[PDB]
Design a protein around this ligand. Structure first.
Ligand SMILES: Cc1cccc(O)c1
Ligand SMILES: Cc1cccc(O)c1
Ligand SMILES: Cc1cccc(O)c1
Ligand SMILES: Cc1cccc(O)c1
Ligand SMILES: Cc1cccc(O)c1
Ligand SMILES: Cc1cccc(O)c1
Ligand SMILES: Cc1cccc(O)c1
Ligand SMILES: [Cl-]
Ligand SMILES: [Cl-]
Ligand SMILES: [Zn+2]
Ligand SMILES: [Zn+2]
Lengths: 27, 21, 29, 21, 26, 21, 29, 21, 29, 21, 29, 21
């Protein structure tokens, strides 16, 4: 479940870092 | 993947930028 | 628009939960 | 896009799944 | 928003209510 | 309920506590 | 346990999205 | 309850739905 | 008001991320 | 203040960094 | 450590709510 | 620090208040 909870935090950080470009999240 | 790379050790903002479009 | 910007933050959290293994491309209007 | 449909109105998880990969 | 405000309220209730928890209805 | 009361105006920690079990 | 405490906060945010209008009931054993 | 079942292993949205009112 | 509160919630999250080891001092207006 | 500068128009991470300690 | 970064993300969210108008100073050596 | 006191055992809202300004 660690991976899942960490991924939830990663997508929030990608949203801010990537600004107007957006990002691609994949497993 | 980002989970294997960024959930084992902290990724800098530069490393996170790897996933931007 | 900040309201739009914060809404997107909430959308990516929801997409993460529903998309699971499929993942997703987030692009901005 | 997703903003026009889900920020001005409530989108269920069923409606959001159309934006997955 | 009311919907996104609600998302924040549930996070706040989780913290404020402790072991008691809460009941959430729309 | 809590949405009508706490999304219209800010609710103190005490007011939110009103909605606990 | 803090791990359980933080997972619980992730669970209520998911229930908010999954239960929508029905809402839900959370209480810790 | 939901903690022992969804914090030790990943729960599907369908599993989480069981905890809905 | 509530919109400023919601905004603040997102700002602290972003400061946590970008400020790193330096940290940050936050106070309501 | 950070609210006056960032709660109506979007602040990039670069503008937000100015609020770091 | 990742767990510490995750814990801190939750703590700043909690301090934002608990501290209200007062605010807080968050730092991580 | 707050990470050392609250990242293993749970800090109540009352203990977290010690970290406010
Ligand atoms: C490595 C890592 C995990 C989660 C969030 C982050 O910003 C960075
Ligand atoms: C409509 C909407 C916005 C943000 C998140 C959601 O799950 C749904
Ligand atoms: C009034 C209000 C709205 C959202 C979150 C809160 O803690 C309080
Ligand atoms: C299993 C699990 C825990 C927390 C959140 C989730 O969406 C799923
Ligand atoms: C995919 C999906 C959406 C909403 C509720 C569910 O139980 C499952
Ligand atoms: C402009 C703005 C407001 C709130 C959060 C952000 O990341 C950015
Ligand atoms: C003990 C602890 C850790 C993280 C967040 C909290 O609200 C409480
Ligand atoms: Cl976590
Ligand atoms: Cl919001
Ligand atoms: Zn978390
Ligand atoms: Zn929000």
């Amino acid at each position: 479940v660690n991976q899942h909870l960490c991924g939830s935090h990663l997508v929030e950080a990608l949203y801010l870092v990537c600004g107007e470009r957006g990002f691609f999240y994949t497993k | 993947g980002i989970v294997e790379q960024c959930c084992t050790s902290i990724c800098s903002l530069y490393q996170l930028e790897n996933y931007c479009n």
